[PDB]
Amino acid sequence: GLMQFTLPVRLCKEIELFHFDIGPFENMWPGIFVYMVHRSCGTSCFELEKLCRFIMSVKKNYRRVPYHNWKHAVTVAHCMYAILQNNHTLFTDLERKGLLIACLCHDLDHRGFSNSYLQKFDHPLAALYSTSTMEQHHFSQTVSILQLEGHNIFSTLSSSEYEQVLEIIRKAIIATDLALYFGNRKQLEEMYQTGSLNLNNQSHRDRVIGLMMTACDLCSVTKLWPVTKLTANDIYAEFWAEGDEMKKLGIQPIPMMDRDKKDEVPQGQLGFYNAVAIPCYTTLTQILPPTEPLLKACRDNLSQWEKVIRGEE
Numbered sequence: 001g002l003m004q005f006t007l008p009v010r011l012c013k014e015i016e017l018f019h020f021d022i023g024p025f026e027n028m029w030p031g032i033f034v035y036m037v038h039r040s041c042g043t044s045c046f047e048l049e050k051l052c053r054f055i056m057s058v059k060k061n062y063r064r065v066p067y068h069n070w071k072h073a074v075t076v077a078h079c080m081y082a083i084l085q086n087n088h089t090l091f092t093d094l095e096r097k098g099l100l101i102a103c104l105c106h107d108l109d110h111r112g113f114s115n116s117y118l119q120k121f122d123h124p125l126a127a128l129y130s131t132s133t134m135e136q137h138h139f140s141q142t143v144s145i146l147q148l149e150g151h152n153i154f155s156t157l158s159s160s161e162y163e164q165v166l167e168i169i170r171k172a173i174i175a176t177d178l179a180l181y182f183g184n185r186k187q188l189e190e191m192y193q194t195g196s197l198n199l200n201n202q203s204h205r206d207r208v209i210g211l212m213m214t215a216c217d218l219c220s221v222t223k224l225w226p227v228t229k230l231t232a233n234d235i236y237a238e239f240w241a242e243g244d245e246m247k248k249l250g251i252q253p254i255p256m257m258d259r260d261k262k263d264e265v266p267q268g269q270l271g272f273y274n275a276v277a278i279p280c281y282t283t284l285t286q287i288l289p290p291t292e293p294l295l296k297a298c299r300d301n302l303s304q305w306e307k308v309i310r311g312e313e
């Protein structure tokens with residue numbers, strides 16, 4: 001109850017910044033996460049014993065894939081932490097509670113394959129969930145872990161508060177389906193431009209939280225260049241494995257997943273920053289002005305990929 005979590009001075013200062021890297025020491029990531037919940041939510045949001053046991057069950061249910069792993073989960077939660085702290089008064093006690101949990105849980109039991117590969121393989125999960133296949137699985141794995149004995153971090157909540165928080169987590173995790181991002185950003189773009197955007201409209205908040213989730217999920221593009229560059233290696237190492245598997249089913253994979261088109265990665269990053277990342281942080285900066293550093297850092301990394309293409313690295 002009187003037990004603060006603290007971090008070494010460099011982490012204590014740098015963790016508050018959007019571009020923070022959680023580092024290569026796996027055993028400090030649980031502590032980093034608890035630090036963030038305590039500062040974001042209060043030391044009283046969760047029974048510590050239950051929270052610690054929830055974090056370790058979540059960790060155990062991420063797999064050793066190159067990118068969609070426990071490190072990604074904590075990175076995405078840290079980005080959400082920075083957004084929530086730079087926008088203190090815009091968010092409910094329930095949202096602050098739900099959204100950090102949502103980010104930690106959002107890729108639970110990922111196998112390193114896209115929804116498209118599950119569908120062409122005919123994986124049982126593609127029969128149970130026709131759209132946002134992995135994302136419905138991620139929410140389903142979240143609920144399972146919440147129902148393990150001693151794991152109900154939401155036990156203090158009322159019956160209807162509990163239902164509201166699980167509904168925030170569900171929509172948050174569904175919104176990490178990048179297929180849904182495009183339409184969601186377009187709608188938020190037009191609502192903001194016609195002045196109809198209203199944060200008391202629950203369906204408007206949903207879209208905004210949706211965009212925050214895309215922003216947090218893509219946050220490798222908002223880091224220091226060497227972090228950004230080394231994460232792209234992990235991202236492609238999954239995609240190329242999936243490409244190999246596509247070829248094993250006798251299907252030419254899209255270029256994104258073809259290791260034979262390695263040389264075109266820089267140009268693929270350009271497309272991605274222009275088609276997805278820049279638009280995402282642009283619209284997010286408009287709706288939440290204090291998130292501008294994510295847009296600024298995304299633009300800087302775009303410029304670093306331009307440099308790679310021009311032979312300047």
Ligand SMILES: Cc1ncc(C)n2nc(CCc3nc(N4CCCC4)n(C)n3)nc12
Pocket residue numbers: 178218220221232235255256257261262264265267268269271272
């Ligand atoms: C940084 C990042 N964060 C999150 C996600 C989901 N992605 N996806 C990419 C790949 C983007 C991409 N790459 C290509 N290439 C085709 C030729 C070689 C590569 N295309 C067409 N599109 N990068 C990221």
Ligand SMILES: [Mg+2]
Pocket residue numbers: 106107134176
């Ligand atoms: Mg995902």
Ligand SMILES: [Zn+2]
Pocket residue numbers: 072076106107176217
């Ligand atoms: Zn993710």
